[PDB]
Design a protein around this nucleic acid. Sequence first.
RNA 1: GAAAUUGAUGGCGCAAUAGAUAUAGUACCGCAAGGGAAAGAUGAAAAACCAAGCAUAAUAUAGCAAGGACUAACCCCUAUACCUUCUGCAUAAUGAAUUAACUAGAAAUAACUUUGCAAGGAGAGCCAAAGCUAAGACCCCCGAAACCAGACGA
RNA 2: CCGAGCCUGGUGAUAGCUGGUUGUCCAAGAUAGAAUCUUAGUUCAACUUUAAAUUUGCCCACAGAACCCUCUAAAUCCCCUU
RNA 3: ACCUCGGAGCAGAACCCAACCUCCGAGCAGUACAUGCUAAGACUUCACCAGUCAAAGCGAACCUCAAUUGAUCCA
Lengths: 84, 140, 41, 55, 120, 94, 95
Amino acid sequence: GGQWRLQQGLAANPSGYGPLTELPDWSYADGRPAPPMKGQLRRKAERETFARRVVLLSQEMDAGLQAWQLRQQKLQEEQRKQEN
Amino acid sequence: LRNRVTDRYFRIQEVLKHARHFRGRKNRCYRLAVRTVIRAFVKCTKARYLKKKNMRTLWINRITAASQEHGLKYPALIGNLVKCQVELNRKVLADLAIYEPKTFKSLAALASRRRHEGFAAALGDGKEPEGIFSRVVQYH
Amino acid sequence: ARALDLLRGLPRVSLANLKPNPGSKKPERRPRGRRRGRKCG
Amino acid sequence: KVEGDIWALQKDVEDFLSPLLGKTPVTQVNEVTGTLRIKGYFDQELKAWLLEKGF
Amino acid sequence: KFTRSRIPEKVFQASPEDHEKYGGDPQNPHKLHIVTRIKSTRRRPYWEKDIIKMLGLEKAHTPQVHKNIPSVNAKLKVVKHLIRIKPLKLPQGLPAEENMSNTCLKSTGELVVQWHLKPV
Amino acid sequence: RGRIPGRQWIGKHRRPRFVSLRAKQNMIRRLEIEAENHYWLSMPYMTREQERGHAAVRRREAFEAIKAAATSKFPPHRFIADQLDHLNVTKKWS
Amino acid sequence: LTYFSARKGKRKTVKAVIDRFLRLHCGLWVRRKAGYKKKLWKKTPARKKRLREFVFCNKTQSKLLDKMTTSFWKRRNWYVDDPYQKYHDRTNLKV
RNA sequence: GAAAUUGAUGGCGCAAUAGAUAUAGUACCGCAAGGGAAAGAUGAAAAACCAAGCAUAAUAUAGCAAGGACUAACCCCUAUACCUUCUGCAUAAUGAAUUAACUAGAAAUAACUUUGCAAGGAGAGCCAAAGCUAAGACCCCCGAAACCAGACGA
RNA sequence: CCGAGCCUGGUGAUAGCUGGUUGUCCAAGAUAGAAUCUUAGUUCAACUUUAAAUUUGCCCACAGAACCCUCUAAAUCCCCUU
RNA sequence: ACCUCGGAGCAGAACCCAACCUCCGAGCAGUACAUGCUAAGACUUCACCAGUCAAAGCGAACCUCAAUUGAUCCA
Ligand SMILES: Nc1nc2c(ncn2[C@@H]2O[C@H](COP(=O)(O)OP(=O)(O)OP(=O)(O)O)[C@@H](O)[C@H]2O)c(=O)[nH]1
Ligand SMILES: [Mg+2]
Ligand SMILES: [Mg+2]
Ligand SMILES: [Mg+2]
Ligand SMILES: [Mg+2]
Ligand SMILES: [Mg+2]
Ligand SMILES: [Mg+2]
Ligand SMILES: [Mg+2]
Ligand SMILES: [Mg+2]
Ligand SMILES: [Mg+2]
Ligand SMILES: [Mg+2]
Ligand SMILES: [Mg+2]
Ligand SMILES: [Mg+2]
Ligand SMILES: [Mg+2]
Ligand SMILES: [Mg+2]
């Protein structure tokens, strides 16, 4: 029943993101945390790359908009300057 | 005959050992044993997908049996357990049905409870208070 | 030299230690097996 | 015909050629044969440089 | 002959009814698309295969973030029948370098910058 | 009795095929997804003029990296240590 | 051609290639255009000028001619006054 | 396809389907020319466990004969032999009873890789505007009806 | 076993034709046509493989690519950005 | 019956496209005698062969045509 999970905002697959999978599978009886699971490390790396790309794309689009605004300015005050 | 093969006995045996449990000459003659053994190995490789599929089918059948014993249908039980947010898989559900009948009865009662809560919500559609079990724990 | 010191450290050079310089002897391709057999190219 | 620290020779060649080429040249240090191979033609420049070094 | 399809421009002109239905204001449009390949490129033209490869949607059900700019939109229009496009939402804003390692893309399309895996 | 001439699904006289409610629902679901795709593509963020050249620097740097990788292809180094290590094959005890 | 001659065991040269083509030491093969002496009365002056020219060959044609001629024909020839002396080497050629 | 000219002590072999055809040109076959085999294994002295095929031990519903399995051989579920050829073969297209043995990729040009030397290389000759020298590494098996020469045959 | 005997030899005749072409493992890999006594084949293209050098390759914004013809298609070419 | 070449549809719009598909044609003729010589850069009948256009320059004056043809050797 993935549609209900999607409606609730969880992953359609319970094996996706969530405590059931992203939490450590085990820990030492003494209480010491276990070394990170290989799948969890790979997933964290993938999410980090995704977030970095999100930031890069947003920054590039913002910089492009700012550059376009600056170019429109340059054009406007130029036009005015050689009009005067 | 400068160079001659001296291991042909062992090369043949490497296949005849896997062919020993066949029928007829397929377990004795290499010309036949090799073909039969290749087919057997291909079947063994392809049989893992079928093993998983048949395991899931058997689990679904047993869960259906237990749910019918308790008056529920398998789709209702599975969907309502998911809605209750109990993520027991089909293997574990069948194991509980076989070996923990009282626990499976409790799970079926929970599934029917959630099903009736959903029916009540649909019937009295609106902003009526959410069902007690219908409430979903939120993780962040 | 460091190479000669390494020789001093290493076992004796004999006819059981000789090896051609890697890349000097290309493997010989002959028509036996699945990949190079059948129609043999 | 290189004798000694072929790796030091490689470092010196890279330092000498990077300004000319614009980027660090790609090279192979054949330690066994005592030779240094550099991608691109630099025979005249390297000959003059080695003459300056005094070899 | 079967050829590349030119989608008329009126198809991609949203109406107020569409805005109400899909919850997106024409002003202040979303910056980034989350695109997931939900359809196989097999049995589809080589140009659609190439566009999918260009967009980096080779793996199905693997979200990819893309700019909401006219050229990327043109490619997405070319391969729109094989992909699901949603707007990337940033409830807590863009992730910072401090929280870059704690992000998660929820199924709703929100890139939460804190992922504690704990009950609310 | 009840033969389909020749091969099913290809000839002039093909075996009839009928759409089930399941198939209709699947196609409708896909159509809904594509309609939402149309909606979300109908709202560009920047215009073509605004986007012009906003990623040129990054694209050029990426291609420069590709060119550097292509032009750095050159045979690997060779080491006297690697050559002499083969003498160890006859390493023995005393 | 004859890959191994019955008397010497050597590779032989197809003398038609020698009679028809010129090899420049750089690896280029020069040839005359076919029909440059045929039916000139019906050919326009531009066509005659094109046909009266010495012409190079494809890479594949050059390779074929190299295969069909032995190494003796690919040597460096220091003839006294060779009209093609300057054409035996390439200059300012990149790749 | 020249010539002038130049100068010049055994086995990284086979070991009885191999190596000679050969234990023998014998047996056998053919009027004749001619064709042409097979094989043997003790010991210092004889004056001393393994191929196929079967038997031990015929067979039980169902099916490319197996696989997943299973407490359990079978029963359950899945599974349209192989090779070649072809657009496409379970194909009712070819080959194959089966075991053992034998049975089929030879090499120049030009390049590539690795050494050596280097405006020179090579142990005369040859090549050379970084080349030359050395090595490595690519080129199958069986099959016609035929043609011609000389013998042998009424 | 005579449309022209048989044997030996040239002879391992030749066959664009059929058949066969024997260890393991990984990887890339199905692409227009032209000529040919040629369409059962081959050579060149195209595709494909390997290695090497270099820098642009694909997608593609406007603008642009004919009248004949009264109307006249899906499209295409070119093509910065991305 | 056909075999080579050109034009038009099929093939409506860059190019290219089969057919023992539909239709037309060609195997010249005319004029000129610089219808001479050279030479950048391009096109190209999907290869090659072959076939095309052509700036500038010299020398002068002050080609039409869709096809209208055929290599090598040898004479
Ligand atoms: N290569 C080779 N060497 C042989 C052969 N037969 C004999 N020899 C050599 O002849 C040499 C002398 O042979 P022996 O039998 O010792 O003496 P021998 O009888 O006086 O020799 P011969 O005069 O050769 O008959 C040895 O070096 C043998 O190896 C042969 O067939 N080939
Ligand atoms: Mg293969
Ligand atoms: Mg039928
Ligand atoms: Mg002589
Ligand atoms: Mg014998
Ligand atoms: Mg036995
Ligand atoms: Mg049968
Ligand atoms: Mg059969
Ligand atoms: Mg047949
Ligand atoms: Mg039979
Ligand atoms: Mg008589
Ligand atoms: Mg007779
Ligand atoms: Mg033969
Ligand atoms: Mg592969
Ligand atoms: Mg062309």
